[PDB]
């Protein structure tokens, strides 16, 4: 049957772990403190991705029903709509954005099996989560780096799964901020500030944008073109940096930590002129990222959704 959903807590208390302004040197103790305070959150994101994956893999509505049941349970519970407790930075907000990405993607993947009683309980929950996140970004004091783009993913997914065109435009807007931040050398001036993790965060900035561009395709919309294919520039710099960190290691004062490019390559393999460049990355194996929707290999090959 459907296993019992964990109780949904209406509060996030996450902890920051970078020590320096570059957001590069992890404090392993504060990182293990966050891993323990966000393990219930991650376990649910993994569980709703896993079951949404299972429905895609074999069509079985039971996995889609158990996914919808868990989401509606956490919607009833008002999960994550509480106080985002500030320990040493905005990690609790970040965590809500990433959890929104996971649950909104997982809803999406199983949305063609939802009763009208499921949508009515799930849709206002995701729309509250999304508008709560957008409100953080209404403040011009908040620098719109990769966090803005990751927030865009879940906002956009909610707008698409709830048929909310103001949330769709909001997502599209963050995507456009991404593509417009991409310089002619393929870099991103704010992620170039991450020192050791400049490459890492370039990759981190790409995955949501690519993923946003795929949700666009679900409405029959090609956003990969924008700004003289600026996403091709950013993708180029990431994949040619996962093998050759020399450019980042030079352009940043710091030496890079090796990168295995994220599962966005699963999708961009099918969209670039020479998808062959992504053969090594592809071979590193089936990519799973709940925050990015789950089984990216599955969704790249057979589609984020079974039916439109």
Author numbering: 22 to 329
Paper passage:
Unlike other PLs, Smlt1473 present in the clinically relevant Stenotrophomonas maltophilia strain K279a demonstrates a wide range of pH-dependent substrate specificities toward multiple, diverse polysaccharides: hyaluronic acid (pH 5.0), poly-β-D-glucuronic (celluronic) acid (pH 7.0), poly-β-D-mannuronic acid, and poly-α-L-guluronate (pH 9.0). To decode the pH-driven multiple substrate specificities and selectivity in this single enzyme, we present the X-ray structures of Smlt1473 determined at multiple pH values in apo and mannuronate-bound states as well as the tetra-hyaluronate-docked structure. We have built and refined the structures from residues A22-L330; electron density for other residues outside this range was either weak or absent. The structure is composed of 13 α-helical segments (α-1 to α-13) connected by 14 loops (L-1 to L-14) and two β-strands (β-1 and β-2) (Fig. 2, B and C (i and ii)).
